[PDB]
């Protein structure tokens, strides 16, 4: 089944893959095998960037699939049925896109979430942990909902911090406050 | 002083909370952003971009929610977060706007500082029902005789001012405001129209001239000027009538009577045209997507003569569409014509002909009322219409210069004098008590004899004479407002007294 | 079963797409209600876009919609209420009494997606409606069960004409009437409510001999289209189920046309000629066929039409011109002449105007009228520049009769005590045939033109001749 | 009255650019460093209160 | 990447599940979406041009657009009951009317 | 910033770049592509995300190879302003295309700027005498005024402007800006030569005029910000130098036209008659940046090459929105031999009034309009019948209108050469007097031809003597 | 295309490339986008009169719609002197037959 629909990015194609292999419940396996084929495509960069660039026939594209399963015969049959579709539609540009999306869908199914606490400067690990504690304490990140709060450096948010995840952010920074301060003292 | 006000401002900011909505800008450029995220987004809501731009959101899509920017492109940057204001668009509405120029978002752009608005309201308030209406009985007199006589204007009534651009297009409306100075000066509150002049698509200099004229005529006090200048954003231009409407509705709701001039809706339509096509919505007929009718209709139907329950408060509307080439078959002009309760066609050729105001009276109609004009004035201008109607046919015969029937040329002779009588110079209205005599004289044919050249001379002198002698007569017309037998006879005697001599 | 939950995905005006539960969609033309502080937003299902995502049209406002918002499914076509306990109520599009005289309906509701009856049911009974309006009766008699069409400018006496019909015919005729308002003002609404309360057709106590369905243009286009459909079903309940003949009234059907053109465009369906929906014909056809003279009943629709710039070869009027049985053209010119009704005398053609189905005597008199008027009209052009100095005495008598007839058309109307101030005059069919005949024979060429103005039949014409005489 | 109002406006814009100068002064300081800690502990307080 | 009718998520998930709907759907069809009375049917691969096809809604249609993935039927019948996934048997006889 | 990029696409002159680094640009930034064709200036116009912008290209396009480095030079392009820009002909990048060597300047300012606010306004309109009777009578000019010409296909749009420049701008000591958008090189050479000759540009000396000239051949994008560059020069003069200003713009149909071309390519649905949906914002912005402030009241003169003479086309229509005077010129009236060729029932000014130029002036103009409108009305009758089949009263009116029309024919000054007839320039005070008499028919009794192609009433009289001889 | 045709300056060798762009107007309706676009670039037009072509001027030059805005500053003095402005004169001929009816 869908682990929540991903569409807006033509990720419904990925969703379809997800739910189809979710109904076979071989999603961890699928994800791992997908990593392996994606990695050996990238690690065959000559004609794993230019064989990610369509120009292949029906027969040559099919023979590329045959070459792909020559690369490893452990790959999970559902993403091999997806490969048939991708060969036939000759689509393959959103192949690493599908890998990434399947990953997103997978870790959504797992319920693991990433996170960033963008600042204009490096952010302490104590800060990561304390905010992670606070955030876990907040109902916003419960348990079963993982969070990887990371530092990002982005001078775009000049000084301060913004915590981000799940379309929920807390922005206590200098830049936003300054913006408001200036504006209000221009009133 | 300035320090104290600033100290209050500094004190006025402190502390905030978690933002449960976000979305990251992606598209940006074309002044219309589309942001990814935002599911909490209630439609038409106002969303604060982290740049400092605010844009309401009019298109929701399961990809990228289309937030129409009010602010500048460069300020917005791709990947910015937008945090929902969480409020559908709203404007402060009250009486503080009386004597104020305001931009679309209700900021005093005259810079008479803050507004003492008694509320905020929403711009999507819907038109009152059948039951919340009452019968229309509230005359409105523009001080232009032709308007009152031919197309009598009530309250809660829509009259569409249509005709070629800037042929004093603004000036016709301003004349109404000036004769409505007399009622405004008058202490009858329900006869005090708080006039709301909406200026869409016009340059600051034009507006500055208008506000100068209004302040000169010191009508600015009861006037509210709602503006969406040429500079101001296309969403803001679309939103400007609807928020003007909200300000009007506060008067209307209170039982107070008010008047809204929507000048010019044609530029509003262009704004919605732009807006819609950069929301990528399919072009309508003439690139104004169909539902533009829906947009305009909801706006226009909020002019209503409300029930006695609602305090009789009637917001009256005068839409203004400046038809290019008199092209009324254009989709928006066709649409508006159907909606409105009158049309006040003006014509450029008649302007050139020297008829100023230049009114194409053949297509000027007011489908509603006659309690939309004074009873006295109804009696006198009864056959003003008939004479003029005969005159139209007669004028056609007169053209080609074929030897007219003496009777047709009697009509022609009478008709011509009437035409000269109607003309009035801009920014000079006329009080109704002294419009009744002029029409009496004309209609009772006493002017028919008086030569065309000296009709203008006669008119001026007649007024002076009535001020001197039959000022008792004027007082009675003012006091009783329906011509009695005694008044008709008195007036006949007076008219005879100055028509002869 | 269970109200299918759908989540809004895209609010793009009225078009709102919903994402109904997997493996379960409603069928086209069903009705979705979404519980809101706006009551039930009604979405008429108009497409399925597959993937358990439908594209439905809103009829009511789409403000504050949260994209992701749960949508209950009524599960079936929009079913309004029908009854004889709908009489004397003003009822909005979604079937809710806006005069709020509690829950209307007899015992039934019906879908507004009622079908147009088959050929076998539809059998034309050429029967004669009589309006008592002399010009209407004589020169283009109206017919019971008809589909009369009042093409004219916006309220160029269009409202007045209908009000006069209601004043005379509606109370007079046993059948109910239904006044259906499509994009008409709430100002106009207050006048109609007041006027029909005044004519008593809205019998304040109990049942009225009319029901009202007042639709407003402010409401989104979807409501504008299917206010017409809603009204139609009530009339159908009278026609079919209760058998009852009706005298339907719709106003302005240009608003219906305009609404349909818009939602065709909005549905994505590429607009055809002059921006009008390519599906115009079949929608008109569906409406027209539903209104019929059948074994079950007879429905005498009078549909007001607004003709843009009084040009009816414009495709929206011109297509309608075919679809209506008994066209009538009313316009500014006749209104301006101060003639009540505003009917253009030589332009209007009803279904019946046969040579003996309207009666041979009636026909012959009316043929004589047509010739007399046609002569005046042809000669009008010569007179305009050249003058009447080059035309004969015989021609002049014909012109004089036509001018007399021209203002004989002016017959006061009681519901234009609002307008003219003159109480109406109603003239029986026989009385009209007789009264017009006399003038033409030249028996009343000694009665001034203005003594035909604003009066009824021959008796009245003579009386006003005497009045003007002394 | 006109110049008095003008003088208040002039005073306000002069004092406005003087405010800009204080903003530039604050963002220079290692208050720029210390207020990151203030924002951090404030986010701890807020988010724990969530 | 691009929009294709076979990439419709229900079709796509079955194919990924190692179930190809072809063979079954050479005559029959299943509606993918029916909007505007323009059902787009997946199947009917044994269809002859302008052949008469009969829905399980009893609707009869003709197939003005034959495209590989979809056959854009134009309905002689109505849309009212019609909905996604509708069985469309292929009558297999090009449009004919009694003559005589 | 050093935002490296590649040229992902070169779809026309709407190059799309892919800024490799995730460092973000901003809309209205400027970029330099460095090529053996020197720098090429691009302006960021969309961010399409993934750090893939879509950029307007100002300078010429060709030779471009995909995967070509970009560097972000940021913001709006900076022109050079000062008194030392007075006398130069400026490209858009500040380059002297009259090649007087690198433009000496004080402060160099961004092309884009904000339009002065409602509060910043200080709107005033004087009287300005053009020395042209028809102009003075029908549309009295004013200081700070916005004049608009809706002439033909440079058939004498340019001639009209040149005469106006010759009279008004050499009778105006304060600064004046000529900005010529997408106009022919020869006109520029003629103008430049003339300016240098007439000392308005003293070449070695100082100039009380500055010039910006943008050639039609130059890419559309350059023409779009040719205007914006000029507006900056004007703003510097208006604001920073404070001095009284004037501005002339021709051909501003090209400004609109250029915008409509790029709009489609940019990926914007081009609204009716192919004209950009953003037509309104641009016209508005330009005319709200050129606006009368207390800083300076800017007299603007705008010349619209009405496209096929359709003024109902959206671009002329939206021009009407921001004008205070128009003097629409009819190509037909040029053919009739009337020079000025201005349509007289399509001239208006806000400063034509019964107290703004006096009741006597207003009455005089009114009668001229009425007379001409009657004459236009009787064109049908005259043609289908004759003038001997017209009424005697009308025949007088017709004769008067013919005389008035001919009186309006008044030789051009700059184009005294081009017409071949010595220019006739007539004072405003003289004009009111002259028309008053003519309307009273005091001089209507002398050849219609005498009225034709001459100045004042006295000149008509003298030419009657010439005709008599 | 057009602005590459020029009379150069003495530095550039004074060389010319005289452009005369010949537009084939069907119906000779010169109010039309393509003709007008050319007219604005050009100085002068050479519209030709069909009526005159039939009426034995081969070729037949309409002179109402033939103009040359800056033409006479190319002319040498003999050809400035001989012509005093025949166009003006023949726009008196034009007027005369205008008002003949």
Tab-separated table of C-alpha atoms in Angstrom, chain F residues 45-353:
chain	number	residue	atom	x	y	z
F	45	UNK	CA	14.395	36.904	-14.494
F	46	UNK	CA	13.162	33.623	-13.084
F	47	UNK	CA	14.546	31.079	-10.758
F	48	UNK	CA	13.187	27.807	-12.001
F	49	UNK	CA	14.780	26.108	-8.993
F	50	UNK	CA	17.592	23.563	-8.686
F	51	UNK	CA	19.678	26.704	-9.182
F	52	UNK	CA	18.556	26.869	-12.776
F	53	UNK	CA	17.592	30.431	-13.641
F	54	UNK	CA	16.077	31.765	-16.831
F	55	UNK	CA	17.755	34.958	-17.826
F	56	UNK	CA	17.009	37.811	-20.178
F	57	UNK	CA	19.986	38.552	-22.401
F	58	UNK	CA	20.638	42.213	-23.016
F	59	UNK	CA	23.544	42.085	-25.441
F	60	UNK	CA	23.730	39.991	-28.632
F	61	UNK	CA	23.586	36.197	-28.738
F	62	UNK	CA	25.477	33.752	-30.955
F	63	UNK	CA	28.583	31.653	-30.607
F	64	UNK	CA	27.404	30.344	-27.240
F	65	UNK	CA	28.489	26.875	-26.224
F	66	UNK	CA	26.437	25.023	-23.637
F	67	UNK	CA	28.370	24.539	-20.405
F	68	UNK	CA	29.739	28.044	-20.383
F	69	UNK	CA	30.743	29.652	-17.139
F	70	UNK	CA	28.569	32.307	-15.644
F	71	UNK	CA	29.509	34.797	-13.018
F	72	UNK	CA	26.944	36.808	-11.147
F	73	UNK	CA	27.739	40.508	-11.163
F	74	UNK	CA	24.547	40.986	-9.121
F	75	UNK	CA	21.776	43.549	-8.957
F	76	UNK	CA	20.670	46.030	-11.554
F	77	UNK	CA	23.279	47.259	-14.050
F	78	UNK	CA	24.913	50.473	-12.908
F	79	UNK	CA	24.785	53.385	-15.289
F	80	UNK	CA	27.018	56.403	-14.782
F	81	UNK	CA	25.446	59.712	-13.826
F	82	UNK	CA	26.688	63.134	-12.949
F	83	UNK	CA	26.896	66.335	-14.945
F	84	UNK	CA	29.637	64.631	-16.910
F	85	UNK	CA	27.056	62.373	-18.526
F	86	UNK	CA	25.541	65.523	-20.044
F	87	UNK	CA	26.240	65.472	-23.759
F	88	UNK	CA	26.903	61.763	-24.121
F	89	UNK	CA	24.902	59.195	-26.065
F	90	UNK	CA	24.745	56.238	-23.802
F	91	UNK	CA	24.147	52.589	-24.547
F	92	UNK	CA	22.596	50.874	-21.548
F	93	UNK	CA	25.776	49.760	-19.841
F	94	UNK	CA	26.883	53.373	-19.731
F	95	UNK	CA	29.028	53.030	-22.801
F	96	UNK	CA	29.380	56.117	-24.980
F	97	UNK	CA	28.000	55.063	-28.362
F	98	UNK	CA	28.828	58.503	-29.615
F	99	UNK	CA	32.303	57.327	-28.579
F	100	UNK	CA	33.387	60.323	-26.519
F	101	UNK	CA	35.501	57.858	-24.524
F	102	UNK	CA	34.532	56.350	-21.136
F	103	UNK	CA	31.736	58.388	-19.596
F	104	UNK	CA	33.118	60.565	-16.835
F	105	UNK	CA	30.783	60.443	-13.888
F	106	UNK	CA	30.267	60.958	-10.204
F	107	UNK	CA	27.982	58.256	-8.869
F	108	UNK	CA	26.983	55.167	-10.797
F	109	UNK	CA	23.454	54.050	-10.082
F	110	UNK	CA	21.370	50.832	-10.542
F	111	UNK	CA	19.041	50.775	-13.626
F	112	UNK	CA	16.066	49.645	-11.567
F	113	UNK	CA	14.553	52.063	-9.105
F	114	UNK	CA	11.291	52.493	-7.237
F	115	UNK	CA	8.431	54.669	-8.518
F	116	UNK	CA	7.892	57.750	-6.231
F	117	UNK	CA	5.032	57.396	-3.779
F	118	UNK	CA	1.683	59.163	-3.545
F	119	UNK	CA	3.212	61.162	-0.694
F	120	UNK	CA	6.303	62.015	-2.778
F	121	UNK	CA	4.081	63.613	-5.422
F	122	UNK	CA	3.941	67.327	-5.973
F	123	UNK	CA	1.963	67.706	-9.126
F	124	UNK	CA	1.974	71.001	-10.939
F	125	UNK	CA	1.239	71.963	-14.507
F	126	UNK	CA	2.043	75.364	-15.938
F	127	UNK	CA	1.453	76.719	-19.401
F	128	UNK	CA	4.136	76.060	-21.938
F	129	UNK	CA	4.003	77.755	-25.311
F	130	UNK	CA	5.250	75.556	-28.115
F	131	UNK	CA	5.014	78.295	-30.729
F	132	UNK	CA	2.619	76.033	-32.632
F	133	UNK	CA	-0.948	77.269	-32.898
F	134	UNK	CA	-2.717	73.944	-33.176
F	135	UNK	CA	-0.815	72.544	-30.215
F	136	UNK	CA	-1.384	75.622	-28.122
F	137	UNK	CA	-5.076	75.900	-28.929
F	138	UNK	CA	-6.075	72.303	-28.531
F	139	UNK	CA	-3.653	71.078	-25.963
F	140	UNK	CA	-1.808	73.835	-24.038
F	141	UNK	CA	1.482	72.375	-22.731
F	142	UNK	CA	2.574	72.572	-19.139
F	143	UNK	CA	5.628	72.112	-17.006
F	144	UNK	CA	5.794	68.626	-15.543
F	145	UNK	CA	3.126	67.669	-18.106
F	146	UNK	CA	2.780	64.296	-19.781
F	147	UNK	CA	2.352	64.680	-23.494
F	148	UNK	CA	1.642	61.812	-25.821
F	149	UNK	CA	1.757	61.502	-29.536
F	150	UNK	CA	0.031	58.680	-31.242
F	151	UNK	CA	1.459	59.365	-34.627
F	152	UNK	CA	2.139	57.187	-37.624
F	153	UNK	CA	5.072	55.014	-38.519
F	154	UNK	CA	7.712	57.717	-37.881
F	155	UNK	CA	6.099	59.533	-40.798
F	156	UNK	CA	6.648	62.728	-38.981
F	157	UNK	CA	6.425	61.485	-35.409
F	158	UNK	CA	10.090	62.219	-35.417
F	159	UNK	CA	9.529	65.495	-37.260
F	160	UNK	CA	7.006	66.606	-34.676
F	161	UNK	CA	9.377	65.714	-31.851
F	162	UNK	CA	12.289	67.462	-33.523
F	163	UNK	CA	10.318	70.656	-33.895
F	164	UNK	CA	9.238	70.441	-30.272
F	165	UNK	CA	12.845	69.896	-29.200
F	166	UNK	CA	13.906	72.803	-31.361
F	167	UNK	CA	11.410	75.124	-29.802
F	168	UNK	CA	10.846	73.978	-26.245
F	169	UNK	CA	14.183	72.429	-25.369
F	170	UNK	CA	16.191	75.345	-26.639
F	171	UNK	CA	13.758	77.540	-24.754
F	172	UNK	CA	14.342	75.395	-21.693
F	173	UNK	CA	17.628	75.971	-19.990
F	174	UNK	CA	17.086	73.195	-17.450
F	175	UNK	CA	18.101	69.622	-18.169
F	176	UNK	CA	16.330	67.606	-20.763
F	177	UNK	CA	16.750	63.989	-21.609
F	178	UNK	CA	16.294	62.453	-25.011
F	179	UNK	CA	15.889	58.748	-24.841
F	180	UNK	CA	15.216	57.194	-28.186
F	181	UNK	CA	14.083	53.619	-27.879
F	182	UNK	CA	14.592	51.288	-30.849
F	183	UNK	CA	14.972	54.058	-33.391
F	184	UNK	CA	16.888	54.189	-36.604
F	185	UNK	CA	20.597	54.986	-36.538
F	186	UNK	CA	20.353	57.739	-39.166
F	187	UNK	CA	17.897	59.676	-37.018
F	188	UNK	CA	20.442	59.432	-34.239
F	189	UNK	CA	23.253	60.664	-36.472
F	190	UNK	CA	21.101	63.560	-37.661
F	191	UNK	CA	20.042	64.419	-34.141
F	192	UNK	CA	23.549	64.145	-32.722
F	193	UNK	CA	24.979	66.267	-35.481
F	194	UNK	CA	22.214	68.784	-35.059
F	195	UNK	CA	22.638	68.867	-31.274
F	196	UNK	CA	26.355	69.395	-31.538
F	197	UNK	CA	25.760	72.037	-34.144
F	198	UNK	CA	23.047	73.789	-32.168
F	199	UNK	CA	25.312	73.852	-29.166
F	200	UNK	CA	22.738	72.158	-26.936
F	201	UNK	CA	25.532	69.701	-26.936
F	202	UNK	CA	28.628	71.796	-26.942
F	203	UNK	CA	31.056	69.007	-27.626
F	204	UNK	CA	34.065	70.450	-25.863
F	205	UNK	CA	31.662	72.446	-23.724
F	206	UNK	CA	28.881	71.278	-21.475
F	207	UNK	CA	25.480	70.230	-22.600
F	208	UNK	CA	22.143	71.048	-21.021
F	209	UNK	CA	20.883	67.924	-22.754
F	210	UNK	CA	21.827	64.307	-22.336
F	211	UNK	CA	20.935	61.669	-24.881
F	212	UNK	CA	20.323	57.968	-24.745
F	213	UNK	CA	19.782	56.275	-28.043
F	214	UNK	CA	18.843	52.649	-28.519
F	215	UNK	CA	18.919	51.264	-32.019
F	216	UNK	CA	16.056	49.156	-33.307
F	217	UNK	CA	18.407	46.393	-34.460
F	218	UNK	CA	19.661	45.939	-30.881
F	219	UNK	CA	18.183	42.861	-29.124
F	220	UNK	CA	14.714	43.341	-27.537
F	221	UNK	CA	16.037	42.907	-23.996
F	222	UNK	CA	18.498	45.744	-24.423
F	223	UNK	CA	15.661	48.004	-25.586
F	224	UNK	CA	13.629	47.119	-22.492
F	225	UNK	CA	16.260	48.444	-20.116
F	226	UNK	CA	17.326	51.268	-22.439
F	227	UNK	CA	14.281	52.948	-21.009
F	228	UNK	CA	15.175	52.004	-17.440
F	229	UNK	CA	18.694	53.333	-17.925
F	230	UNK	CA	17.272	56.637	-19.136
F	231	UNK	CA	14.909	56.791	-16.183
F	232	UNK	CA	17.921	56.481	-13.902
F	233	UNK	CA	19.674	59.352	-15.708
F	234	UNK	CA	16.516	61.398	-15.310
F	235	UNK	CA	16.187	60.489	-11.659
F	236	UNK	CA	19.744	61.601	-10.962
F	237	UNK	CA	19.029	64.943	-12.584
F	238	UNK	CA	15.626	65.259	-10.945
F	239	UNK	CA	16.726	64.234	-7.513
F	240	UNK	CA	20.434	64.487	-6.948
F	241	UNK	CA	21.111	67.440	-9.245
F	242	UNK	CA	17.643	68.780	-8.381
F	243	UNK	CA	17.486	70.754	-11.662
F	244	UNK	CA	14.388	71.232	-13.828
F	245	UNK	CA	13.941	68.344	-16.170
F	246	UNK	CA	12.279	67.414	-19.408
F	247	UNK	CA	12.295	64.050	-21.056
F	248	UNK	CA	11.452	62.877	-24.527
F	249	UNK	CA	10.831	59.254	-25.405
F	250	UNK	CA	10.315	57.959	-28.909
F	251	UNK	CA	9.447	55.241	-29.892
F	252	UNK	CA	7.701	53.843	-26.861
F	253	UNK	CA	5.678	51.484	-29.000
F	254	UNK	CA	9.049	49.734	-29.243
F	255	UNK	CA	9.221	49.540	-25.458
F	256	UNK	CA	5.911	47.728	-25.392
F	257	UNK	CA	6.770	45.722	-28.490
F	258	UNK	CA	10.061	44.478	-27.110
F	259	UNK	CA	8.322	43.317	-23.958
F	260	UNK	CA	5.709	41.309	-25.831
F	261	UNK	CA	8.410	39.481	-27.779
F	262	UNK	CA	10.306	38.339	-24.700
F	263	UNK	CA	7.130	37.507	-22.764
F	264	UNK	CA	6.181	34.533	-24.917
F	265	UNK	CA	9.693	33.166	-24.822
F	266	UNK	CA	9.938	33.718	-21.053
F	267	UNK	CA	7.017	31.363	-20.818
F	268	UNK	CA	4.248	33.793	-20.123
F	269	UNK	CA	0.956	33.410	-21.937
F	270	UNK	CA	0.926	36.496	-24.178
F	271	UNK	CA	-2.396	38.231	-23.616
F	272	UNK	CA	-4.630	39.713	-26.366
F	273	UNK	CA	-3.098	40.682	-29.741
F	274	UNK	CA	0.005	38.842	-28.540
F	275	UNK	CA	0.820	41.592	-26.034
F	276	UNK	CA	2.365	40.481	-22.718
F	277	UNK	CA	0.096	39.982	-19.669
F	278	UNK	CA	2.616	42.147	-17.793
F	279	UNK	CA	2.049	45.089	-20.151
F	280	UNK	CA	0.148	47.003	-17.522
F	281	UNK	CA	2.740	46.649	-14.790
F	282	UNK	CA	5.548	47.810	-17.060
F	283	UNK	CA	3.755	50.817	-18.557
F	284	UNK	CA	2.526	51.743	-15.117
F	285	UNK	CA	5.931	51.396	-13.534
F	286	UNK	CA	7.596	53.520	-16.177
F	287	UNK	CA	4.995	56.200	-15.850
F	288	UNK	CA	5.051	56.067	-12.061
F	289	UNK	CA	8.819	56.441	-12.080
F	290	UNK	CA	8.457	59.367	-14.404
F	291	UNK	CA	6.232	61.362	-12.139
F	292	UNK	CA	5.977	64.876	-10.769
F	293	UNK	CA	7.585	65.149	-7.370
F	294	UNK	CA	8.756	68.036	-5.245
F	295	UNK	CA	12.226	66.850	-6.326
F	296	UNK	CA	11.264	67.800	-9.842
F	297	UNK	CA	8.231	67.884	-12.071
F	298	UNK	CA	9.227	65.931	-15.119
F	299	UNK	CA	7.770	66.963	-18.417
F	300	UNK	CA	7.556	63.794	-20.505
F	301	UNK	CA	6.822	63.484	-24.193
F	302	UNK	CA	5.940	60.022	-25.412
F	303	UNK	CA	5.665	58.992	-29.029
F	304	UNK	CA	3.738	55.908	-29.906
F	305	UNK	CA	4.014	54.329	-33.300
F	306	UNK	CA	0.437	53.241	-33.230
F	307	UNK	CA	0.579	49.754	-34.751
F	308	UNK	CA	-1.325	49.926	-38.027
F	309	UNK	CA	-2.901	53.023	-36.451
F	310	UNK	CA	-5.071	50.905	-34.115
F	311	UNK	CA	-5.293	52.875	-30.859
F	312	UNK	CA	-7.759	50.383	-29.466
F	313	UNK	CA	-4.869	47.919	-29.434
F	314	UNK	CA	-4.051	47.407	-25.772
F	315	UNK	CA	-0.702	49.134	-25.897
F	316	UNK	CA	-2.042	52.568	-26.988
F	317	UNK	CA	-5.026	52.059	-24.711
F	318	UNK	CA	-2.818	51.633	-21.625
F	319	UNK	CA	-0.769	54.657	-22.635
F	320	UNK	CA	-3.906	56.797	-22.307
F	321	UNK	CA	-4.068	55.749	-18.661
F	322	UNK	CA	-0.895	57.578	-17.711
F	323	UNK	CA	-1.119	60.682	-19.936
F	324	UNK	CA	-2.420	64.171	-19.107
F	325	UNK	CA	-2.396	65.385	-22.700
F	326	UNK	CA	-2.562	63.592	-26.000
F	327	UNK	CA	-2.100	64.949	-29.470
F	328	UNK	CA	-3.029	61.966	-31.585
F	329	UNK	CA	-1.785	62.611	-35.127
F	330	UNK	CA	-3.609	61.141	-38.078
F	331	UNK	CA	-1.693	59.835	-41.066
F	332	UNK	CA	-4.699	60.766	-43.210
F	333	UNK	CA	-4.525	64.409	-42.136
F	334	UNK	CA	-0.844	64.351	-43.153
F	335	UNK	CA	-1.926	63.196	-46.625
F	336	UNK	CA	-4.369	66.116	-46.853
F	337	UNK	CA	-1.215	68.246	-46.673
F	338	UNK	CA	-1.868	69.666	-43.239
F	339	UNK	CA	1.383	70.044	-41.355
F	340	UNK	CA	0.812	69.953	-38.292
F	341	UNK	CA	-0.967	66.653	-39.025
F	342	UNK	CA	-2.480	66.354	-35.522
F	343	UNK	CA	-6.110	65.084	-35.416
F	344	UNK	CA	-7.968	68.008	-33.791
F	345	UNK	CA	-10.934	66.186	-32.343
F	346	UNK	CA	-8.421	63.785	-30.886
F	347	UNK	CA	-6.331	66.206	-29.015
F	348	UNK	CA	-6.994	66.869	-25.389
F	349	UNK	CA	-5.154	68.399	-22.524
F	350	UNK	CA	-6.167	68.715	-18.920
F	351	UNK	CA	-4.873	72.272	-19.228
F	352	UNK	CA	-7.345	73.172	-21.961
F	353	UNK	CA	-10.008	74.942	-19.928
